[PDB]
Design a protein around this ligand. Structure first.
Ligand code: CDL
Ligand code: CDL
Ligand code: CDL
Ligand code: PC1
Ligand code: PC1
Ligand code: PC1
Ligand code: 3PE
Ligand code: 3PE
Ligand code: 3PE
Lengths: 80, 48, 120, 175, 48, 171, 105, 98, 347, 110, 41
């Protein structure tokens, strides 16, 4: 499992490089901390119009102006 | 235009509903010149 | 025909409402006939491989009989369920449309006139 | 004249199949199908289907009709044709193709305008630019959704392509 | 029915083999006549 | 069918904002900051009513508040704004990333002479709540009543009377 | 044999591509989103036999939204009458259909 | 119905009539079959782009890929025929009369 | 063939039929038919002889034409309905195209002209698959689109299929072509009762698959491909002699055997719907199938016996062949008629 | 529109250069020459290997046709599913390549 | 039943199989040497 690895690195380095790159491409998106930021950036990219809501009277988490405190903020994206 | 033709309600819809229908390209640019029709319907496609 | 009934609960071999029906007894003539088909399959299986037909493979004939009775018990349960659903839907549609199913006035033969055809 | 261009291409498209459904040869059949693929791709591209037109070129024409011409060229043993000096070897080609465009322009006659003008599409047919879409081709995002929404579709398609490789390698063995 | 039996045998005499085609086309045209009389359906509509 | 009720030409006339798209893109973030309220009341009316014929006057309110956005730039800070939208106007894709010193001059002069804060990255894409006095549409699709569903099955399931009733089978 | 495995197990294998009114990427509407939504909500759960004869108005509105045959018929009628009046010399086109009016926005 | 759809259907039926009257070769049959596939691609694409129905835009590519794989299978069959007789002639494919 | 590759390809055939059976979408119907054809093409070429390549070429041409006609029917449905649900079709042009395409995939007449050829060109197990498993997917689509199927067209195809599958069985000594014309006749029987009661369609399908599988399993157990080669069964394995022929007496449609179970039930659903002439004609043609297949029965259980001397060597060796489910399928193809009201499980 | 004009100008320049390349030396009255290669009268034998590499091109080209919308599919919200299906397609292309390997399909044109 | 069109039809083979070269190039003088090649692909 180690002498076989040295043998296949001696005979066929192309397939060893291919299986190593493919194995890292499989495992490393889960072992990474920055993978969640890909999800967050792709879900915070505004392709549509943010259709507003009628104010029924009791919605504390929804702002009234873009320059309000509450609302989803992208301080993490500006700073990183 | 439609004076001589009998049985013609002007502005008669073809939909039985009264909901607003998004107008087709010919409902807007039908009675106009050909260059405006070309710039309306192939302008974005033919643009370089 | 009844595929709209098995469309809100698909791929149920026996629904829960089928449990409101009596199961077939283990002395059902249909189930004993399916066991006879198992015994026939055992005899044909010992015949086509040139075995002594009654003697050889008594475990094999016992599994033929048991497997046919086992599948046939559930097939008889599903048969009873489907004819019960057929009669239940029939009776509900008769009860829900009386105007399409009027009660015919039964006339006795003292009012009913039949043309007599002499045989000679 | 310029307005009816998709319709014009469609007419040429129909005529293109008459190039090879009459079947003069499998090689000229492939040539007519390549020309028909190009003009049907022009029909696709003139509704804003840019990616689908480039799939016509890249996968249908440059991917598959290359293989059809390749397999045809490994069959149907060839023979020479007329090879006199330039009054035959290119002059007859130019007169024949000028007669082909004469046939293309020749069908737009009084039997055509009774269908064209009574059922005028250009003016109200090509409606792909009806309002705004945004910062994205809707057709591009619909093809992009093959990976998020089309999980079962990609599974059965990749399984069919793997089985296609296996099936070709099993039937082309002879043993 | 009898007239189309005569017509079927007339079509059978111009068919040939003779008497068999006479009887076959006569019985077939008889069934056509009886289907026109009693309303017999060959491609019957699904009703139940 | 019924005659579609299109409003008159006099009911459509308004004072247009006759500026080009680079003028609008250079003045986009401050417009989203300062012209928030009639814009969101209009687009709430536009997605609730699903009909522009009932969204006319609110739309004119947009076209009443956009011009007063630009006049307040034209009285105070027309020259940094002109220098900014000219550099926006040069580019083919109209990049914000090519015009940062003119952006800083326009934001500085606007924050001084008017006091407008350019919004942060992430804020103009927010879903906001909108207080209106107009009613909620009870049927924006103008749909008629649905047909009534079939009566469902109920009751205890009885066995089949005398089996299958198939010619001679008693079970 | 319609073995509805997708309703038994609770998987969505191909329901998403089926109708236009389903969840589209980036909330893109179809051209006939309202008409197909009304035909589906009308004809839901009542079966095909009742759905043919009891939702024909919504279905014809949706078919006419798809094909636009009545709208193309109406535009061909109006354009034919306009061409005949321009040919007779009894009508003149307006400036806002000839291209001399400096369009709205 | 519509006009350009009628043209693409006309091409489909013309390549069908070419696919239903064989002259000499099996490659002519495969070419008429793939002209049919091409017309199906064109007509599906114009419908899907016309209605702005977004998720079906992956459908013609699917309609391409499978069917192109199908054509590959047909080509391989032709090759095995041309490895037995030397030609791809359909009149060499008549041993199954008995 | 590599047995792992054989298992993968057979599971791909089953997967294509299952994708046609379970899908609510037309593209997946088409994908399942494409997968089914693509995977079944090496099953025909298991032996690598020119008759299998000819059979696979004819099968590819017919099934590919049917697949393209199916996709044209789907496309015309998307025109006139804008949707993709596998339900009734919203144009009778698309209905006619899908009915013609499914008749081509089943090999119903007048698109029957590939069925006795291809079944002749391929081995017995691949012919078994072609005549049992490949019916399941187009009959499933016909089950799901029957509110749009034209009555006159499906009855025309049904009676034409029964007549041509009847008169195909005269001139044949090949067992595989006789099974192919029996296939054509039984598909006419199945599609006769489709617009009246599709439960009887599924009953006819299951009884047909059981009888066809019994017959092909007997043909594989005896390795006989012709009538004249079948005629030596009495001297080699005498228990094999009658089981073929009581199964074929079932396949004709003959009481008290269970092959009388479909046709009678089909007549039992067509005299309800006031069609008396049409089941009468179809079952007279089934008696014509009895005529030719009873002549084959006379050929094997009686007159044309005589053996050759090398058969004496076969007496010293039993069948080591897998006769898989052959006693079970032989019991289920004859003695099932007293359990005829089991058909309610197919609703 | 500009694209069609550009294609038409490229096609016109191509046909013009071909027409000049054929008609300009046919001004010459040089010689009518007679008496018409590694084969003289041999037929073409078919080669199975060239057809195998053509069909291998076509099947991997279909797999590439599936792989083409990946720069657009990277922008989606369901990145776990998108990554799984992207890796699954490239893995099935690799499995098709390994099956082409081990069954001696890539031999004598490896 | 052997009719007129069916009399010449012989029966198929029993095991269902039917009874079914390589390239030769001349690399001529086009030092100098001629090469006759029996090639096999
Ligand atoms: C029972 C019927 C099915 C039996 C199948 C197997 C028969 C067999 O192997 O026989 C041999 C065996 C005796 O053989 P052996 O001593 O081992 O030696 C081998 C011989 O030497 C054999 O010598 P050989 O093998 O060297 O060759 C001689 C040759 C000689 O033959 C020839 O040369 C040619 C054949 C002669 C001409 C054709 C004759 C007729 C053929 C067709 C018959 C069709 C009739 C069916 C109805 C009509 C519709 C088609 O062939 C034979 O004799 C064939 C052997 C089998 C004969 C019987 C065949 C029965 C199966 C077919 C009919 C039944 C199924 C369909 C029913 C349809 C609906 C009713 O016979 C039996 O064992 C018979 C069974 C006796 C006891 C029955 C007890 C039943 C109890 C039931 C209740 C208990 C269970 C309860 C379960 C539930 C619990 C909850
Ligand atoms: C539910 C529907 C099931 C439908 C049938 C499924 C199996 C057929 C397909 C696969 C197959 O070929 O299996 C071979 C097949 C036997 O067929 P064969 O190769 O033709 O038999 C030749 C000799 O019997 C082989 O004899 P042997 O010398 O090799 O050794 C004795 C052998 C050894 O077997 C064992 O050792 C089995 C126990 C171990 C199993 C594995 C454990 C791990 O025992 C048997 O094979 C005895 C025959 C078993 C009965 C076969 C038919 C079953 C009933 C089919 C449905 C009938 C429905 C009738 C309805 C009538 C009214 C409509 O089955 C088995 O070997 C296992 C039977 C398991 C039965 C389970 C029943 C309940 C299922 C729920
Ligand atoms: C405290 C806890 C414990 C309590 C214990 C209580 C129980 C103790 C006893 C346990 C054992 C019970 C056995 C079953 C009960 C009696 C069933 C019965 O006789 O039904 C009368 C049944 C109708 O008569 P019934 O007067 O209306 O009913 C009297 C009872 O109330 C019948 O009542 P039902 O209203 O329930 O009747 C049900 C229904 C009544 O039937 C109907 O509604 C009409 C459908 C009948 C079948 C018609 C099919 C016609 C076309 C196909 C013909 C094929 C060929 C015929 C056979 C050829 C040879 C294979 O049956 C069916 O639908 C199933 C089909 C018939 C199967 C009968 C049971 C057979 C089991 C053993 C099979 C052995 C092979 C026999 C021959 C195979 C064919 C049967 O008779 C017939 O249909 C005649 C056929 C022969 C009947 C089988 C006799 C059973 C015993 C046979 C032993 C000897 C076997 C010899 C070797 C093999 C043959 C060569
Ligand atoms: C001659 C033997 C076959 C006759 C079978 C008829 C049985 C029957 O129910 O007849 C009523 C049916 C009539 O069906 P019907 O009852 O629906 O007729 C119309 C309804 N009434 C009578 C109220 C107006 O008779 C037939 O269909 C006769 C034709 C039989 C089929 C053709 C046989 C050709 C020769 C073999
Ligand atoms: C931009 C890229 C490069 C473009 C191409 C190059 C530019 C110049 C193109 C023209 C070159 C001159 C003409 C072609 C060469 C002629 C050579 C030749 O053999 O001529 C003898 C030939 C024939 O001469 P001959 O009558 O002696 O025939 C010789 C053959 N025997 C004796 C056997 C019959 O002359 C011609 O054909 C005349 C050609 C045109 C002469 C010039 C006219 C004006 C051209 C401008
Ligand atoms: C072998 C198959 C490997 C891949 C299996 C599917 C992986 C996956 O992404 O599943 C989640 C996906 C989708 O889940 P999801 O996480 O994308 O859900 C989010 C919701 N949508 C899709 C609307 C954005 O699939 C399923 O949940 C069900 C489909 C797969 C069912 C199993 C198929 C097996 C095929 C064997 C042949
Ligand atoms: C799980 C991650 C994703 C994996 C899938 C994606 C991979 C991307 C690359 C695809 C490659 C496709 C083709 C692979 C074929 C493998 C079999 C093979 O080539 O066997 C033959 C070869 C011996 O060489 P030979 O036959 O002589 O070659 C002819 C020329 N001389 O035999 C060899 O050379 C041995 C080759 C196999 C063993 C290689 C081991 C590499 C290990 C690298 C480190 C660990 C990586 C982690 C994953 C494990 C991978 C095994
Ligand atoms: C042997 C049978 C083993 C059956 C195992 C269970 C399979 C199952 O769940 O089947 C469900 C099916 C009833 O499902 P249903 O919705 O009625 O099907 C619609 C038909 N178009 O149930 C059935 O169809 C039951 C009968 C199946 C018989 C199959 C073999 C003949
Ligand atoms: C509502 C109902 C829904 C549907 C219900 C279920 C329908 C089932 C349809 C079954 C169709 C099966 C077709 C045949 C099996 C497929 C794979 C196959 O062919 O296996 C046979 C196998 C091949 O071995 P091989 O080595 O190739 O033999 C040739 C000589 N060398 O081995 C052999 O050749 C050995 C010989 C015996 C093979 C017997 C196979 C019988 C399989 C069918 C059983 C009956 C049908 C299922 C039960 C009833 C349900 C209809």
């Amino acid at each position: 499992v180690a002498a076989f690895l040295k043998n296949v690195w001696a005979k066929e380095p192309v397939l060893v490089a291919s299986f190593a790159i493919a194995g890292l491409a499989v495992i490393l998106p889960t072992l990474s901390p920055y993978t969640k930021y890909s999800l967050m950036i792709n879900r915070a990219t505004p392709y549509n119009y943010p259709v507003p809501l009628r104010d029924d009277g009791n919605m504390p988490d929804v702002p009234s102006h873009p320059q309000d405190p509450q609302g989803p903020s992208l301080e993490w994206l500006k700073r990183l | 235009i439609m004076k001589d033709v009998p049985g013609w309600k002007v502005g008669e819809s073809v939909f039985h509903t009264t909901r607003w229908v998004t107008p087709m390209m010919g409902e807007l640019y039908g009675l106009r010149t050909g260059e405006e029709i070309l710039s309306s319907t192939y302008g974005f496609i033919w643009y370089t | 025909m009844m595929t709209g009934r098995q469309a809100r609960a698909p791929l149920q071999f026996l629904p829960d409402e089928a449990r409101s029906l009596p199961p077939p007894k283990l002395t059902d003539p249909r189930l004993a006939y399916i066991g006879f088909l198992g015994y026939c399959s055992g005899l044909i299986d010992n015949a086509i491989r040139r075995r002594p037909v009654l003697s050889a493979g008594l475990h094999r004939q016992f599994l033929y009989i048991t497997s046919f009775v086992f599948v046939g018990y559930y097939l008889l349960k599903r048969q009873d369920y489907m004819y019960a659903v057929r009669d239940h839907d029939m009776f509900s549609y008769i009860k829900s449309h009386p105007e399409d199913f009027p009660e015919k006035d039964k006339k006795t033969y003292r009012e009913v006139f039949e043309e007599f055809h002499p045989v000679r | 004249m310029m307005t009816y261009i998709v319709f014009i291409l469609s007419i040429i498209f129909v005529m293109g199949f008459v190039g090879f459904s009459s079947k003069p040869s499998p090689i000229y059949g492939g040539l007519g199908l390549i020309v028909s693929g190009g003009v049907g791709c022009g029909i696709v591209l003139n509704f804003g289907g840019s990616f689908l037109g480039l799939m016509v070129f890249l996968i249908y024409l440059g991917g598959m009709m290359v293989v059809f011409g390749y397999t045809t060229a490994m069959a149907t043993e060839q023979y020479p044709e007329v090879w006199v000096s330039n009054k035959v070897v290119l002059g007859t080609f130019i007169t024949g193709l000028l007669m082909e465009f004469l046939m293309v322009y020749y069908v737009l006659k009084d039997k055509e305008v009774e269908i064209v003008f009574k059922f005028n599409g250009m003016g109200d047919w090509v409606i792909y630019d009806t309002g705004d879409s945004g910062f994205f081709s809707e057709e591009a995002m619909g093809i992009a959704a093959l990976y998020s929404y089309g999980t079962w579709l990609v599974i059965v398609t990749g399984w069919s392509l793997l089985i296609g490789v296996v099936v070709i390698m099993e039937i082309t063995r002879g043993n | 029915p009898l007239n189309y039996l005569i017509g079927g045998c007339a079509g059978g005499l111009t068919l040939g083999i003779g008497a068999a085609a006479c009887a076959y086309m006569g019985l077939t045209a008889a069934l056509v006549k009886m289907g026109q009389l009693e309303g017999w359906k060959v491609f019957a509509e699904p009703k139940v | 069918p019924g005659i579609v009720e299109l409003p008159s030409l006099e009911d459509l006339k308004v004072q247009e904002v006759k500026v080009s798209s680079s003028v609008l893109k250079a003045a986009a973030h401050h417009y989203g900051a300062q012209c928030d309220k009639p814009n969101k009341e209009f687009m709430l009316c536009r997605w609730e009513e699903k009909d522009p014929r009932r969204c006319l006057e609110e739309g004119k309110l947009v076209n009443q508040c956009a011009l007063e956005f630009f006049r307040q730039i034209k009285r105070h800070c027309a020259e940094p704004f002109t220098e900014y939208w000219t550099c926006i106007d040069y580019s083919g894709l109209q990049l914000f990333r090519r015009c940062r010193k003119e952006q800083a001059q326009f934001d500085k002069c606007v924050l001084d002479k008017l006091g407008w804060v350019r919004p942060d990255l992430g804020e103009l894409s927010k879903v906001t709540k909108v207080k209106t006095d107009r009613p909620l549409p009870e049927n924006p699709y103008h749909s008629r009543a649905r047909p009534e569903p079939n009566p469902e099955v109920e009751g205890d399931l009885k066995p089949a009377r005398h089996g299958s009733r198939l010619f001679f089978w008693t079970m | 044999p319609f073995f509805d495995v997708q309703k038994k197990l609770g998987v969505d294998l191909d329901h998403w591509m089926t109708i236009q009114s389903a969840e589209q990427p980036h909330r893109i509407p179809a051209r006939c989103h309202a008409f197909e939504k009304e035909w589906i909500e009308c004809a839901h759960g009542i079966g095909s036999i009742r759905a043919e004869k009891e939702c024909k108005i919504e279905f014809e509105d949706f078919r006419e939204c798809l094909l636009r045959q009545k709208t193309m018929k109406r535009l061909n009628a109006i354009k034919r009458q306009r061409d005949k009046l321009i040919k007779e010399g009894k009508y003149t086109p307006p400036p806002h259909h000839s291209g001399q009016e400096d369009l709205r926005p | 119905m519509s006009l350009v759809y009628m043209n693409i259907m006309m091409a489909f039926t013309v390549s069908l009539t070419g696919l239903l009257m064989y002259r000499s070769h099996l490659m002519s049959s495969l070419l008429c079959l793939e002209g049919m596939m091409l017309s199906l691609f064109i007509l599906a694409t114009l419908m899907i782009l016309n209605s702005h129905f977004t998720l079906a835009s992956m459908m013609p590519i699917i309609l391409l890929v499978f069917a192109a794989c199908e054509a590959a299978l047909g080509l391989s069959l032709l090759v095995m025929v041309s490895n037995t007789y030397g030609t791809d002639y359909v009149q060499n494919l008549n041993l199954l009369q008995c | 063939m590599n047995p792992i590759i054989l298992i993968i390809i057979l599971m791909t055939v089953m997967l294509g039929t299952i994708i046609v059976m379970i899908s609510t979408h037309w593209l997946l119907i088409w994908i399942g038919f494409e997968m089914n054809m693509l995977a079944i093409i090496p099953i025909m070429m298991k032996k690598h002889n020119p008759r299998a390549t000819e059979a696979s070429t004819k099968y590819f041409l017919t099934q590919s034409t049917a697949s393209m006609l199916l996709m044209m029917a789907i496309i015309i449905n998307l025109m006139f309905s804008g949707q993709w649900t596998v339900m009734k079709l919203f144009n009778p042009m698309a209905s006619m195209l899908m009915t013609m395409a499914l008749a081509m995939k089943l090999g119903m007449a007048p698109f029957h002209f590939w069925v006795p050829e291809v079944t002749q060109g391929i081995p017995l197990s691949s012919g078994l698959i072609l005549l049992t498993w490949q019916k399941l997917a187009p009959m499933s689509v016909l089950y799901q689109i029957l509110p749009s199927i034209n009555l006159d067209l499906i009855l025309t195809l049904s009676i034409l299929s029964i007549t041509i599958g009847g008169w195909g069985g005269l001139n044949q000594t090949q067992l595989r072509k006789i099974m192919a014309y029996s296939s054509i006749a039984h598909m006419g029987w199945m599609t006769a009762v489709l617009l009246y009661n599709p439960t009887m369609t599924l009953l006819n399908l299951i009884i047909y698959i059981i009888m066809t599988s019994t017959m092909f399993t007997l043909f594989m157990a005896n390795s006989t491909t012709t009538t004249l080669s079948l005629s030596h069964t009495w001297n080699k394995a005498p228990i094999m002699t009658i089981l073929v022929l009581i199964t074929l007496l079932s396949m004709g449609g003959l009481p008290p055997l269970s092959g009388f179970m479909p046709k009678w039930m089909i007549i039992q659903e067509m005299t309800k719907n006031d069609s008396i002439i049409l089941p009468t004609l179809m079952a007279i043609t089934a008696l014509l199938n009895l005529y030719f297949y009873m002549r084959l029965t006379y050929s094997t259980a009686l007159t044309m016996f005589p053996s050759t001397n090398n058969m004496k060597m076969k007496w010293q060796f039993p069948t080591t062949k897998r006769m898989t489910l052959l006693p079970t399928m032989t019991v289920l193809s004859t003695m099932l008629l007293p359990l005829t009201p089991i058909l309610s499980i197919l609703e | 529109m500009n694209l069609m004009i550009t294609l038409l100008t490229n096609f016109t320049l191509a046909t013009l250069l071909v027409t000049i390349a054929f008609w300009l030396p046919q001004l010459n009255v040089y010689s009518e020459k007679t008496s018409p290669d590694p084969m003289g009268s041999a037929r073409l034998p078919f080669s199975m290997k060239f057809f195998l590499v053509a069909i291998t091109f076509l099947l991997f080209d279909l797999e590439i046709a599936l792989l083409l919308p990946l720069p657009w599919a990277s922008q989606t919200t369901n990145l776990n599913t998108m990554l799984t299906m992207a890796l699954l397609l490239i893995f099935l292309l690799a499995v098709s390549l390994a099956y082409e390997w081990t069954q001696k399909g890539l031999e004598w044109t490896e | 039943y052997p009719t007129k069109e069916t009399a010449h039809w012989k029966p198929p083979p029993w095991n269902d199989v039917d009874p079914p070269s390589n390239l030769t190039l001349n690399f001529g003088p086009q030092g100098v040497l001629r090469l006759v090649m029996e090639l096999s692909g």
